[PDB]
């Protein structure tokens, strides 16, 4: 997907809760740096609900589309108050941007 517009989708839909630069300050959501390759519930100094650790699934770009389409449905009991990326293109735009700032 597009790497330039995926940054815009992050700034408007994800920046208020998450940070991507290494050592980024935890907000309402976790710092999503280097999240690809590691599983779910990666505390590193953060408090998660047991629901996301309960679904110990490795974060590859395929299942995160399954997650960002409906966070409640993919993880019953999650804390992320997010509407969801209803368009597959917006999912491919946003995920490609994370594939750079979260390496």
């Amino acid at each position: 997907g597009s790497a330039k517009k995926g940054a815009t989708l992050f700034k408007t839909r994800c920046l208020q809760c998450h940070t991507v630069e290494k050592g980024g300050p935890h907000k309402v959501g976790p710092n999503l740096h280097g999240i690809f390759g590691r599983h779910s519930g990666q505390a590193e100094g953060y408090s998660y609900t047991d629901a996301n650790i309960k679904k110990n699934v490795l974060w590859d770009e395929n299942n995160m589309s399954e997650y960002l389409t409906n966070p409640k449905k993919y993880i019953p009991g999650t804390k992320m108050a997010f509407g969801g990326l209803k368009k597959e293109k917006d999912r491919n735009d946003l995920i490609t941007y994370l594939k750079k700032a979260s390496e």
Binding site: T12, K27, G83
Partner: protein
């Protein structure tokens, strides 16, 4: 020789699925036009639209309300406190031309009910029967709350809408949606981090993080926190009055109770000043787009 009484007449030849299609037409465009106002969606303005039209009611003489649907007149269209509500009206313009039978009151109220449900909020029972009215019934300006007041103004204003302390604190929890616009109202900044999803964060943010009354660039006082959130003078007075404070704690703790109480108060709000005959059907409970598999 008598105060006005607004009888609900259901549109001829309409039932449940006839209005369920209208919900789906509204909820569908909330999916497509998801770019409005930096990817907030039309949800927040759609419920403020339903609020500002239903908030014009006056229980003393039963004027205004959602019944007449007189927002389509320029007299209510040019309200400074209704600045920015044109976008919620243009969102419903193509919907009303597709269904030329529905009344403006039923359409406006259905828009707010749709957005609350679609934004993961509580299911709000809805009723039909609102009827259009001429122009002489368009209420005058200044029938909506001023944002630059204290808790005494909040309690005395909502009594005009016949709502107790508990019912008014629940309605304020809808401010967790959307944001304030400078060129619209005179305040800037969002209320919370989940400005597109109906959540409990409103009461949480009030007590979680502190606030320091600062200046904005439009010469208005706003309570701003370090995390970027902001509130209004009338909104901040909720944690100054102890009786309103005893209710923000139960809302910030038992979220299910807040969803349960908001749907009661939001229905009563949209049904003010409307007397339904008993031959009218039971309140509808429309199904969200996820419940239909979309």
């Amino acid at each position: 020789t008598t105060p006005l009484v607004h009888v609900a007449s259901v549109e001829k030849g309409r039932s449940y699925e006839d209005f369920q299609k209208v919900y789906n037409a509204i909820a569908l465009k909330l999916r497509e036009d998801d770019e409005y106002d930096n990817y907030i969606g039309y949800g927040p303005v759609l419920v403020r639209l339903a609020w500002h039209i239903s908030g014009t009611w006056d229980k003393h003489d039963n004027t205004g309300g959602s019944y007449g649907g007189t927002y389509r007149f320029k007299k209510e269209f040019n309200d400074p406190s209704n600045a920015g509500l044109q976008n919620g009206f243009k969102f419903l313009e193509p919907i009303h031309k597709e269904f030329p039978w529905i009344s403006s009151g039923d359409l406006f109220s259905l828009g707010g009910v749709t957005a609350v449900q679609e934004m993961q909020g509580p299911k709000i029972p809805w009723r039909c029967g609102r009827v259009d009215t001429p122009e002489d019934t368009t209420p005058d300006n200044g029938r909506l709350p001023d944002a630059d007041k204290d808790a005494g103004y909040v309690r005395t204003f909502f009594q005009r809408l016949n709502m107790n302390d508990r019912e008014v604190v629940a309605l304020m929890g809808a401010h967790a949606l959307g944001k304030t616009h400078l060129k619209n109202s005179g305040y800037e900044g969002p209320y919370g981090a989940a400005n597109n999803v109906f959540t409990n964060e409103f009461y949480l943010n009030l007590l979680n993080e502190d606030w320091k009354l600062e200046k904005n660039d439009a010469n208005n006082e706003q309570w701003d926190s370090k995390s970027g959130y902001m509130m209004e003078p009338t909104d901040y007075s909720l944690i100054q009055d102890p009786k309103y404070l005893s209710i923000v704690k139960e809302y910030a703790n038992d979220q299910d109770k807040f969803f349960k109480d908001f749907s009661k108060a939001f229905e009563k709000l949209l049904e003010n000043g409307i007397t339904f005959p008993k031959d009218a059907p039971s309140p509808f409970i429309f199904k969200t787009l996820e419940e239909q598999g979309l």
